[PDB]
């Protein structure tokens, strides 16, 4: 058994339409390999300033004959800034038909996010804590362990297809991986930290020069661009002639001509030999202004995101601690088999 | 863009 979800390519952001709630109340959420907790926008949620937070469809629990309500505060804060807080509850949750009860998740009552999220990474990771650093609910079974525990799903595993740029959608599969999307044979990599699906990647070759990395990289659905530490992020735009801008007061972000050469490509050589090849069409972000910010950006935090995401085939596996990959293969073509 | 748990 394996559950194919198609995931909208909303720009920014993946997101899914999932029910809630004995009335099966749909809501469109983004798929976040990058987070663990599962969150819907309340239908009386007080959205952030200038957020329209309830255009993705909204929760409302008490129309829902099972939602129960737990009574622990929820709060988390993303690596974009935005924040969401509410209360912790349990519902039915329906994903394509298949259904799960007594999912515990979290109805959203202010937030600065654009809808509601469906983090599927690691329990360790979920948002149980306070802003005292204090935790304030015990760890939980979220949505990929339920669906496991509840026999919808052999291994708490799924692939990962965000499909081309162009794409109006792609599909992530819970417990099942797609042969057909993907060329060669994946390579097993593995996960290097008990909270976030991260593997080592070894080194990025662009314009001809190869830079040697060796440390972890997040495989983030829910991040849009490239994220490397400074110096490193420097090496990469010095070669690819981005330049960097203070945008804020502290926020610099890499800028690069919108007509910059994008026939080439960058590639990126993981620790068990996985390699994927990556458009250069990627790192050129087109703002509204007539400006391009580059795909890469300089962080404390290393993320492949979304940009590096789309041309990989990728088989996360949260029971195994590993993510297999591949060079993706765009085909509507389709040959599923059960993880 | 956004960048999502850290």
Redesign the interface.
């Known amino acids: 058994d394996s559950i194919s979800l198609s995931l909208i390519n909303e720009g920014?952001?993946y997101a899914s339409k999932v029910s809630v709630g004995s009335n099966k109340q749909q809501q469109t959420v983004?798929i976040?390999?990058?987070?663990?907790?599962f969150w819907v926008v309340d239908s009386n949620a007080q959205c952030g300033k200038g957020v329209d937070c309830k255009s993705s469809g909204t929760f409302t629990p008490s129309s829902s004959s099972s939602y129960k309500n737990l009574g622990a505060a929820f709060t988390?804060?993303?690596?974009?800034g935005?924040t969401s807080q509410g209360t912790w509850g349990k519902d039915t949750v329906t994903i394509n038909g298949v259904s799960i009860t007594g999912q515990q998740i979290a109805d959203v009552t202010q937030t600065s996010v654009d809808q509601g999220?469906l983090?599927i990474?690691y329990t360790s990771?979920e948002?149980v804590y306070d802003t005292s650093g204090r935790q304030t609910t015990p760890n939980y079974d979220n949505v990929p362990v339920t669906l496991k525990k509840q026999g919808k799903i052999r291994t708490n595993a799924y692939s990962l297809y965000l499909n081309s740029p162009s794409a109006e959608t792609g599909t992530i599969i819970f417990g099942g991986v797609d042969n057909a999307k993907y060329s060669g044979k994946l390579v097993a990599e593995q996960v290097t930290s008990s909270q976030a699906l991260t593997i080592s990647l070894a080194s990025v070759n662009l314009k001809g020069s190869s830079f040697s990395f060796g440390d972890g990289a997040l495989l983030?659905?829910?991040?849009?661009?490239t994220?490397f530490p400074s110096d490193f992020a420097a090496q990469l735009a010095d070669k690819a002639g981005a330049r960097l801008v203070q945008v804020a007061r502290d926020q610099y972000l890499y800028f690069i001509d919108c007509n910059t050469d994008t026939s080439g490509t960058t590639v990126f050589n993981f620790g068990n030999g996985a390699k994927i090849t990556v458009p250069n069409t990627e790192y050129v972000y087109q703002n509204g202004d007539g400006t391009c910010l580059w795909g890469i950006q300089p962080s404390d935090?290393t993320?492949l995101?979304d940009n590096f995401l789309r041309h990989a085939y990728l088989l996360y596996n949260l029971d195994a601690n590993t993510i297999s990959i591949a060079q993706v293969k765009y085909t509507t073509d389709s040959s599923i088999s059960a993880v | 863009x956004v960048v999502x748990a850290x």
């Open positions: 920014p952001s983004i976040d390999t990058g987070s663990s907790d988390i804060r993303y690596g974009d935005s999220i983090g990474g990771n948002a983030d659905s829910g991040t849009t661009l994220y935090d993320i995101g």
